Amino acid sequence: IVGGYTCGANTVPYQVSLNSGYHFCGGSLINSQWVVSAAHCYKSGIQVRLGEDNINVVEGNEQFISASKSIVHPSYNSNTLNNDIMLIKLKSAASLNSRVASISLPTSCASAGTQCLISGWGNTKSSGTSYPDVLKCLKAPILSDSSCKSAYPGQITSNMFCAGYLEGGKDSCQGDSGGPVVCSGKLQGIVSWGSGCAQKNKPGVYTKVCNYVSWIKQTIASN
Numbered sequence: 001i002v003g004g005y006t007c008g009a010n011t012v013p014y015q016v017s018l019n020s021g022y023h024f025c026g027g028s029l030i031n032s033q034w035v036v037s038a039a040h041c042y043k044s045g046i047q048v049r050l051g052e053d054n055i056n057v058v059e060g061n062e063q064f065i066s067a068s069k070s071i072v073h074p075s076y077n078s079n080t081l082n083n084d085i086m087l088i089k090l091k092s093a094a095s096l097n098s099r100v101a102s103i104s105l106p107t108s109c110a111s112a113g114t115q116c117l118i119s120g121w122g123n124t125k126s127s128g129t130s131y132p133d134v135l136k137c138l139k140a141p142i143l144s145d146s147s148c149k150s151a152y153p154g155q156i157t158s159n160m161f162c163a164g165y166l167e168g169g170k171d172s173c174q175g176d177s178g179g180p181v182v183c184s185g186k187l188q189g190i191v192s193w194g195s196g197c198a199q200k201n202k203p204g205v206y207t208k209v210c211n212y213v214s215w216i217k218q219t220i221a222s223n
């Protein structure tokens, strides 16, 4: 997160860190045994880390649970990132508490101007690199689809939205992908891609979760 602020420990209790010996992606807890992340985060040997604040320190509220099954969206395209969403089932249920809590799925799609909370452990610099270890937060609005498509001609699909600031300075960045975009208590987005971080006219691009709620619910109910 570039241009954000320190969330505060366990203030984003649905935020997870996906760890394969190191933090590689964010995710969102959606019930005790399932996490939503980006399909581009798919890999073997995932451990889901819940209840984290500083990812380099065991502070006493963490739960570490291995993934048992990963389900990449049936239509995910790795060349274009269309349908950039995946479900991860945990080997055992997380114990739900004040520090480890699920986030609601949308019941409808959110609009341009809706304010959201984006969070993650990614790079905090727009030029060069610095990783914060504690969770960072950013308040950002959803941008109109026309400004998103104009910023990224030929690359934005009906399954994506832009959020952030066209003037630059505030954005998600390397190591935030897979993590949450939450608006009025609903997981509307997944951190997906962009061109650089916090550059003018290059806002972050996010998977449009509302289009996937039917698939998420059906997949969870059958697995």
Ligand SMILES: CNC(=O)[C@@H]1C[C@H](N2CCc3c(ncnc3OCCC3CC3)C2)CN1C(=O)c1ccc(CN)c(OC)c1
Binding pocket: 024, 040, 078, 079, 080, 081, 122, 155, 171, 172, 173, 174, 175, 176, 177, 191, 192, 193, 194, 195, 196, 197, 198, 203, 204, 205
């Ligand atoms: C260490 N983790 C990372 O670096 C991940 C990998 C992810 N990338 C996306 C493109 C892509 C991937 N995997 C196959 N193909 C990819 O792109 C192919 C081209 C299609 C049009 C996207 C995976 C971008 N990452 C971010 O954390 C990130 C988050 C937010 C922003 C917004 N400023 C950002 O901006 C550059 C980057």
Ligand SMILES: [Ca+2]
Binding pocket: 051, 052, 053, 054, 055, 056, 057, 058, 059, 060, 062
């Ligand atoms: Ca921690």
